[model samples]
Target: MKTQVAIIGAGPSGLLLGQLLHKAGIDNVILERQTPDYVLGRIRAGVLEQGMVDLLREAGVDRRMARDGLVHEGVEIAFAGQRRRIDLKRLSGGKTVTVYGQTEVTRDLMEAREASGATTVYQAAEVRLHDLQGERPYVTFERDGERLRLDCDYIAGCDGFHGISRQSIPAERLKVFERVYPFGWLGLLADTPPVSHELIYANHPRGFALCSQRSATRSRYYVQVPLTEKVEDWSDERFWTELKARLPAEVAEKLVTGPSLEKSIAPLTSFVVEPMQHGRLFLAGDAAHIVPPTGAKGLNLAASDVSTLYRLLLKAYREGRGELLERYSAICLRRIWKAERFSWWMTSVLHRFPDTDAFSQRIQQTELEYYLGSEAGLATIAENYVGLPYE
Candidate 1:
């Protein structure tokens, strides 16, 4: 098979990029190692920055999100046994975030791909990239025991952090910066009304807890846990108990509990691979960088990367300009670094570390108090939360 671009992952990033390219009359093919059902089963972030929302609309995949996604103008923070609200709209010049699950976004993109009759190969195995340094790039994979090759002008490595896209690059050419947190997030999904209309992030003496929702009747919550903790160690009853204990009294009083629909513990990390592009291959989404979930920037970052790559590709194909393509890495790294800093800062302020001293705890509290009390600090939070303008 031959195409203009060969996408190595069918996750939201690759799919979103394909959708946009298809709309622009650009031809691309997507290869995935898992079935569509398997891909859609993965639960992820629910917060959508305005930039991501706009990209979805540009891809013609936001109809359901437009109708069902909840709008959150502000977020509540619970600390010192009280709740403080940061008005995202007020602080960020009327910018706000949408509470739409990543699963729904992926579903929308998948449906759009089907409607567009785009080429997507699920269950593709042993995907490989070759000739990235040359003008001609191609990908090969096994499908049902048959070796298949796809020739393309460019290859998009959207297969994520663990996938082969980033690994395809030689070690000496890549510079990695990473920090793994001491603790992980123990998250629970339940079928009950959310604790509040807006998401609440709590910094308690015991640990950090987040109260969020996927929809009006489906709630998602998380608590900071030791890195060694296992999901089997906590029962539904115990999870609810610990979560309430970390919340403010008034907020916890109104909490609803139910059997968990899904539960997992995910380690936190802020990671970035410098220069997201190499030769004829361009990296997007988790293939390029990762941020702690504290700032809810993972999926949004992926969307922004896709948006950048899409525009550059459009220019390269339509106008025969490769200048923007040459600068993709530098352009994306600026925004990626800012997001990493924000995510790291949020994680530091909200989570309790095993080695955190009394002095550090007092400083964390002081920082929180200052941010809550000052307009500049709140504006910083709101602007980043709503997302910086896409370059």
Candidate 2:
């Protein structure tokens, strides 16, 4: 098999990239290790930025999403005996967020790709790529117990942080920046309806708790837990108690207790890989870098990267301009570093440090209060949270 481009991992980034390139009449192949159901059922990000919705609609993945997605005007902040809601429309010029999970995105893109006869290889058992430095770089994998190989002009590594493609590049040239937080998020999916209309980000002595909605009947909540905490330890009753302690009185009564179908610890980290591209191989999404969930910017960043890559590939495929290819890393890094900085800043501000003293806690609470009360402070968050300089 042969194609102009090969994309690894059919997550949001890879699937969206494949659709974008295919729509532009570019031949692209997608390789994933998991079955379609597994990819569609993965539990992850549910918030979609306004920019992401527009891009997805233009790329033809927003048909079902637009029908089912719940739009939010803004998010709320609760802490220090106050509930402050930042009006995103007023601050960000009418930008709104949609409650569409990343899994939904994968489903839509995969269906669209299959319908259009795009080359998508699922369960590619022995996936490997060779000669990334050569003219005809090729990927080797197995499907249905049969070994197969495909030659390609370029490779896009969207596999993930644990994927093999990025490591395939020479190690000496890789410069990595990363920080792992002391706490992880214990994400709980409850059968109860959302207690609030918009997401409520709460801070209390128990730690940080983020309350967001999956649908009217399903709720997604996050609480800070020890890095080594086990799911078996957090029973349903204990989960509700912790949530009540962290939540404000405004929504506590409405918050319903239910059996949790999804309970897992999601670690927090801020990471960046310098120069997201090297020759014929371009790194995108988690394959390139990762960010903590505090800013809710991971999937948005991945979408932006591949969106930019699609434009560059179109230029090369249509106008025969390859110069854009040479600058992929430089262009991606500018936005990547900006997001990294913003995520890092938010993580530090909201989370409690192990060494935090009484004075430090007071200062942190004061700073948070100022942000909630002042218009300028809300604007600072709305600007970065909605979308940022994704040229």
Candidate 3:
């Protein structure tokens, strides 16, 4: 097989990258190890930043999103068992986040890909990229137990953290930075209405709980759980009990549980790999970096990576200018690190630590109180949670 570009993994990054390239009249082939059904239904992040909405709309993938997506200007922080609403409009001057699941976005992008007649080989694609230094960079993969080779001018590795791209790098050429958290998130997708209009980040004596949404009719939530917790151990009755413990007592009665679609623990970690690009090969999205889900940054960062790569490739392809491609690593790292820092900060602030001192505890309490008390702190948090402006 041969194409202008070979995209590994058809997740949000790869799908979006393929769509953007197609719109630009560039041809590419996408490889995926999973079926389209699985990828479209998989539960993932739902927060869409201001920039993400703009880009998606511009690319014509926001048809369902614009109709079904919910927009919020801020979030509410619950600490000491009290509610404090932070208005993001003040800090960001009306910048807001749109609520649309990563699953939904991929579904829409996949539809766009089909509508454009771009080829996406689904199920059991075993991909191996090669010869980044060569004039014609290429990848080899198996799509149905049959080995095949694909030659391309460039390789876009958007296969995500568990995909082949990360391990494909030679150990001698990789510099890794990773931070693992003491606790993990037990995420749940419930068929129930949310208890609150905005997201609630609760700091309770028991643990931390996040109240988020997938759509207005459906709610998605998470709670800090034991590192070794198992889904089988948590019965439907036990799930509701934990939710009641975290939620305010008065509003707890109004909420009812539904069929739990998926249950799993997501480990908290911050991971970054140096040099996202090598010659003609470029790594985008989760293949390049990983962020804790606390700040809802994973999908947004992935989109930003696609955005960067789309423009860079356009410049290189249209004008035969490699300047953008040459600066891709440096420019991407600058944005990646900022997101890493922000995600780390948000995770640390919301979750309690085993090593926390009395001073740290008291400081957290004081800070929580200050955010609720004054207008300034609340504004800062609301803006950050809704999303920080991305270039």
Candidate 4:
């Protein structure tokens, strides 16, 4: 097979990149090692940065999102038993985030690809990239015990952190930075209505808890737990009781509890690989970096990468601007680091750390107070939370 771009991994980044490239009159193929059902089963961050929401619309896949996704104009931060709303729209100059589940985003993109007559190979196994630095690059994989090779002008490694796209790079050429948090988030997905209309991030003496939503009736909640904690140890009753104790009296009074549809514990980590490209294989999304979910940048960062790669690839194919690829990592890293900082900062201020002394606790409370005490501090949070403009 011959194409202009060979995309690896059919996740949101890969699929979005393929869709946008196809819309740009660029020919590309997407290879996924798993079934579509497996991909959709993966629950992920639900907040959509404004830039990503716009990018989805530009890719012609926002019909469902526009109608079903909830728009959050403000975000609440609670500390010292008081809740303060950070007016995201007003503070960030009218920018807002959409609360749409990542699963739904993937489903919409999948349907869009089907209607566009694009090719997506599911159950592709043992996928490998060859000759990425050369004039021609190709992907080889097995499907139904049959080996196939796809030749393309460029390769997009959207496979994610463990995906071969980044692994294909020489170890000496890669510089990695990472920090693993001492705590994990025990998240519960329930069909009950959320306690609040907008997302509420709480900093309590117990730990950090987030009240987020997938839609009007589908709620996703998270509470910080030690790394040694196990999901099986906490029953639905215990989880609800603990969550209520950490939240304010007013918010907890209106809380509704239900059987959880999904429950899991995810460790927090901030990781980034500098220069997100090697040869013709450019890494996008999780393949390039990761952030603690505090800033809600995981999926949003992936969307940003998709947006960057889509634009640059179109330039390379249509305008013969292959040189533009060099700018991809630099452009992406600048934004990536800022988000990394924001996520780390938010995590620090909100979560109770293992080393949190009374002095440290006072400082953390002051940090929250300082941010909410002034318009300037609120503006900083609002702008970063809503997302910065695409470079």
Measured by TM-score, the strongest candidate is: 1
TM-score for each prediction?
0.99, 0.97, 0.96, 0.98
Give lDDT per model, in order.
Answer: 0.93, 0.86, 0.83, 0.92
lDDT of 3 by residue, 89-170 (tens): 6666777888888888988999899888998888746678788788987788786678888899988989999988777777
| Clashing residue pair totals per candidate (backbone < 3 A) | 0, 0, 0, 0
Model 1 agreement with the true structure over 300-358: per-residue lDDT tens digits: 99988999999999999999997779989988999999999999999988888888789
The positional error of residue 161 in candidate 3, measured at the CA in angstroms, is: 0.4
Could you give candidate 2's per-residue lDDT for residues 1-391 as a string of tens digits?
A: 8999999999889999999888888999999998888887778898988878888987988889989899888888888768888898789877878888787788888889999999888888768889887888999998897889999999999998888778888877789988988999999988889998899888777788989878889999988898889988999888888988888886887888799888888989888887787668899999999999888888988988888888899898899997878888888888888888888877776776777899988988988888777889888888888877578
**Better candidate by lDDT, 1 or 2:** 1
- Error (Å) of candidate 4 at residue 296 is 0.5
Backbone clash tally (model 3): 0
Off by over 4 Å in 1: none
TM-score, candidate number 2: 0.97
| TM-score for candidate 1 | 0.99
User: Which RMSD values do the candidates have, in order?
Assistant: 0.8, 1.3, 1.6, 1.0
Off by over 4 Å in 3: 371-374
